[PDB]
Amino acid sequence: KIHPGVAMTVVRTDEILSENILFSSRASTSMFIGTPNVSRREARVDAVTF
Amino acid sequence: PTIAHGDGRRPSKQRTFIVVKNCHKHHISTEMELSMLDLEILHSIPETP
Amino acid sequence: MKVQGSVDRRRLQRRIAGLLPPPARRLNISRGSEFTRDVRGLVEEHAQASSLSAAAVWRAGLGWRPPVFGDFLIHASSFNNAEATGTPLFQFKQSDPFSGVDAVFTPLSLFILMNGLTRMANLLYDSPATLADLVPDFGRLVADRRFHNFITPVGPLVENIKSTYLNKITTVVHGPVVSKAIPRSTVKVTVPQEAFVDLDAWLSGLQPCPADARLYVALTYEEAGPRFTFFQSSRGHCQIMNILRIYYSPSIMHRYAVVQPLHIEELTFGAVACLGTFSATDGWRRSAFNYRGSSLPVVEIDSFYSNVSDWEVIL
Amino acid sequence: EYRSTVNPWASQLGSLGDIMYNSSYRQTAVPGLYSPCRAFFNKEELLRNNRGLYNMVNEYSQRLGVVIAGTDVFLEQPCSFLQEAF
Amino acid sequence: MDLKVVVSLSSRLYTDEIAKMQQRIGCILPLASTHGTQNVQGLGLGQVYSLETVPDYVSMYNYLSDCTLAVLDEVSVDSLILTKIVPGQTYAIKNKYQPFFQWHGTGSLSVMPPVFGREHATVKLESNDVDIVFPMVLPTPIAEEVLQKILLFNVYSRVVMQAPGNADMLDVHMHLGSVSYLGHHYELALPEVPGPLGLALLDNLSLYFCIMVTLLPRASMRLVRGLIRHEHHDLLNLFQEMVPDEIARIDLDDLSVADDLSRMRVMMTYLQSLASLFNLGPRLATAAYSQETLTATCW
């Protein structure tokens, strides 16, 4: 426990789970909604998946 | 219910699961006494007051 | 005054109703009138499927993937009745009599023949001298190193009808593994967790990830006898062999004494085959056997497409 | 009950006949040649036949009073099933 | 069974490049990982082949065979629509390489790194500070010829060190430099210094060569030693009347069929393994072709 030759600095990174508030003014963004499509992904031996 | 996702990952499958519970049974027991004389005179027929 | 929402269900119902394939045609033979009606429907369907004249007669708008089943018959000693469904099996060739038994082999049976997992294999097979009787030249074929040519891979088993001496066995040869009794329920393939080396992690910019990851099988003659190893890799048939040789080099260094300078028939260190292909980016699953003396941990892999390969020399 | 063996040269674990026909030391034998004495001298064969007969007997008896595995039975080789020769 | 991959670009199209990308429709490139949404830099071959970096082509082969291969289908101002190569599917293909090679029917096609020219098969998208590098699909004969030339150069470069310049000019750039075709000759890019990870193939080659040269047969040497001196053949134009005396020294002993046969068996068995160290490229089989459209059906 003798002091070594030289001093040091120590660095860490810390996370924080934080609850945040969001503000958005009226008519900020224009959204266009498409029309949904269907496809058939796989014909399984037991079921069908779309 | 489930949400739609837009990222590169495969689409989240809709989920329906089966939940099975067990029914408990409780028993309750009360003890009561009746002296033999209390049960005997019921069979006898009283006339005098 | 409900919002009506953002998406409409009529569209989804319509397009999915369009996506459904027409039903299979049952034929009713017991009753006369139903038979006649289905035959009328059959002739109309052939008229509707083969006449280039009309356009609604064009039906091809918008896969057949069961496995190719092959049935083998084996003795009830050379197979446990309890051994799990889907374990890859390997086959042997008899010289004159083949109809008597096929003598299909399991990895634990190979571990027994070759001499924890040892105790499990003995609790399956206490007196495996029939195992020695199945291959008469085992002591000869370890040295002639012709052992791999005769051990042909058969892959996972689906069903085994159980009899006193013989066993009926159905084996997936090519294609995805699938069953038969029901609307084709699927199976999975199991290999013991020990005596299996993950060669994608044995050496562990960013390495690319392919779609499909393959399972190889290799057979090595070390001074501690022969032994079998299956490898879960994904890179390529041209690189798996090189990486495997780099892996075996510490075991290869020991073979200077055993090799014969005069007779060159023993030199080969092993051979590699490719069994099948499964989904990458997933991994595998861990489970133990449920038998009487079951202590072995086992990897099990989903989505197995059985495409067996031949033994290729490595040294 | 009064004797144990008609020929001690055969019915022992390391006798001459046992060396001849048992599954122990026939490794160098050219495969694909039928041997009658195989079904009487191969130790594992005898053990399998005895276990199979005992299991037939007790599985008929202890049943009729749970999963019923269906057993397949035949008669083409009764000599092997009974360890007897006519 | 149905695979459509969209790759999204953060920045814009910058029309200067879109015309060259659009006449670049229908051609192969290897993508990083199979998902519905991809990164832009993993898309091309630009990761493995940095401009400042010296090319090591066996590493390019190793990267190329690992990644999934995709058919460019459509370029849109913000989108890249590519269907991929399912191992059990059949699809059309149409190609235009600036080193332009003419195809035949039922000829297997090999996928290779762009050894010839960087500017040729690479299109710079400096809008994202990226460069899309297309791989080279050639007929299998010219593919194996060029790969063999590459490995022989990687050897003879280590060889020609500290030798007369007459070695420096000749072997380094007479046969290892150019590749011929019908009335045509294309130069190759050559690694200025021998590349690592290339000879990693050559080590295995030396291993197989030691094992094979331990088991060479005898009668063939006698036949050849006879045919070079007594007779004349075109295949034997290589050897003149003089024989390499090595063959005379090995030849001394007599013949026996029983010896030749086991040697022949083990030689055959060690010849099946070379196809793993010689391919190093996903192969596509030709089913039909039209020179008037330059659009074949590979498989």
UniProtKB/Swiss-Prot annotation, chain A:
Q: Where in the cell is it found?
A: Virion; Host nucleus
Q: How does it assemble?
A: Homomultimer. Makes the hexons and eleven out of twelve pentons. Interacts with triplex proteins 1/TRX1 and 2/TRX2; adjacent capsomers are linked together in groups of three by triplexes, heterotrimeric complexes composed of one molecule of TRX1 and two molecules of TRX2. Interacts with scaffold protein; this interaction allows efficient MCP transport to the host nucleus. Interacts with capsid vertex component 2/CVC2. Interacts with the small capsomere-interacting protein/SCP.
As for what it does, the entry says: Self-assembles to form an icosahedral capsid with a T=16 symmetry, about 200 nm in diameter, and consisting of 150 hexons and 12 pentons (total of 162 capsomers). Hexons form the edges and faces of the capsid and are each composed of six MCP molecules. In contrast, one penton is found at each of the 12 vertices. Eleven of the pentons are MCP pentamers, while the last vertex is occupied by the portal complex.
Record organism: Epstein-Barr virus (strain B95-8)
Name assigned to this protein: Major capsid protein
Which residue spans adopt a coiled-coil conformation according to this UniProt entry?
A: none
Within the intact protein, the region shown is: 1037 to 1086 of 1381
**Similarity-based family:** Belongs to the herpesviridae major capsid protein family.
UniProtKB/Swiss-Prot annotation, chain C:
Native source species? Epstein-Barr virus (strain B95-8) (HHV-4)
Pfam families cross-referenced by the UniProt entry: Herpes_VP19C (PF03327)
Query: Which cellular component, as a GO term, is one annotated location?
Result: viral capsid
- The domain of life for this entry's organism is Viruses
GO BP annotations listed: viral capsid assembly
The GO terms describing molecular function are: DNA binding
Q: Which UniProt keywords apply?
A: Capsid protein, Host nucleus, Virion
For this chain, the family text in UniProt reads:
Belongs to the herpesviridae TRX1 protein family.
Per UniProt, subunit arrangement is: Interacts with TRX2, MCP and capsid vertex component 2/CVC2.
Q: What is this protein called?
A: Triplex capsid protein 1
General function of this protein: Structural component of the T=16 icosahedral capsid. The capsid is composed of pentamers and hexamers of major capsid protein/MCP, which are linked together by heterotrimers called triplexes. These triplexes are formed by a single molecule of triplex protein 1/TRX1 and two copies of triplex protein 2/TRX2. Additionally, TRX1 is required for efficient transport of TRX2 to the nucleus, which is the site of capsid assembly.
Cellular compartments annotated: Virion; Host nucleus
From Swiss-Prot, chain D:
Q: Where in the cell is it found?
A: Virion; Host nucleus
Instruction: State whether it acts alone or in a complex, and with which partners, per the record.
Output: Homomultimer. Makes the hexons and eleven out of twelve pentons. Interacts with triplex proteins 1/TRX1 and 2/TRX2; adjacent capsomers are linked together in groups of three by triplexes, heterotrimeric complexes composed of one molecule of TRX1 and two molecules of TRX2. Interacts with scaffold protein; this interaction allows efficient MCP transport to the host nucleus. Interacts with capsid vertex component 2/CVC2. Interacts with the small capsomere-interacting protein/SCP.
Q: What does this protein do?
A: Self-assembles to form an icosahedral capsid with a T=16 symmetry, about 200 nm in diameter, and consisting of 150 hexons and 12 pentons (total of 162 capsomers). Hexons form the edges and faces of the capsid and are each composed of six MCP molecules. In contrast, one penton is found at each of the 12 vertices. Eleven of the pentons are MCP pentamers, while the last vertex is occupied by the portal complex.
Q: Which family does it belong to?
A: Belongs to the herpesviridae major capsid protein family.
User: What is the recorded name of this protein?
Assistant: Major capsid protein
Source organism per UniProt: Epstein-Barr virus (strain B95-8) (HHV-4)
Give the gene symbol. Answer: MCP
Q: Which residues of the full protein are shown?
A: 1235 to 1332 of 1381
Swiss-Prot record, chain E:
The record's Gene Ontology cellular component field reads: host cell nucleus; viral capsid
Protein's UniProt keywords contain Protein transport: no
InterPro entries referenced in this protein's UniProt entry, alphabetically = Herpes_capsid_2 (IPR002690)
Localization terms from the record:
Virion; Host nucleus
GO MF annotations, alphabetized: structural molecule activity
Major site of localization recorded for this protein: virion
Q: What does this protein do?
A: Structural component of the T=16 icosahedral capsid. The capsid is composed of pentamers and hexamers of major capsid protein/MCP, which are linked together by heterotrimers called triplexes. These triplexes are formed by a single molecule of triplex protein 1/TRX1 and two copies of triplex protein 2/TRX2. Additionally, TRX1 is required for efficient transport of TRX2 to the nucleus, which is the site of capsid assembly.
Q: Which HAMAP family does the UniProt record give?
A: HSV_TRX2
Q: Which family does it belong to?
A: Belongs to the herpesviridae TRX2 protein family.
Subunit composition?
Interacts with TRX1 and major capisd protein/MCP.
Q: What is this protein called?
A: Triplex capsid protein 2
Gene this chain is encoded by: TRX2
